[PDB]
Design a protein that fits this description.
This is part of a larger assembly, with chains A and B. Chain A is mostly helical. Helices cover 39% and strands 0% of the residues of chain A. Chain B has no helices and no strands. Chain B is largely without helices or strands. The radius of gyration of chain B is 34 Å and the shape is rod-shaped. The chains are: A mainly alpha, B little secondary structure. The chains hardly touch. Chain B: It is found in: Virion.
Amino acid sequence: MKQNINIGNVVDDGTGDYLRKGGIKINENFDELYYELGDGDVPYSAGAWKT
Amino acid sequence: VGFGFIAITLLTMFINVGLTLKHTETIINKYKNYKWDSGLPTEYADRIA
């Protein structure tokens, strides 16, 4: 679920996530690992808990 | 007359390597490098996957 993005290569090419695919893909990749940690707009060094 | 002589023989070889060698042709290319570190502004859109 980490939602790694695939990477295009060195030249204009149609293969791989085009940046708008990455757009929200990485932006997700944040929130996932982030929400599990941050739970909202702030991250927690002590971690986060879910009621 | 009155003399013999002694004879060693030899040979040489005359060969063009270089005439074949040349530069065939030279080409080049035009690229737009994505460095980030830019705004869009001029124009828009255009090439669309």
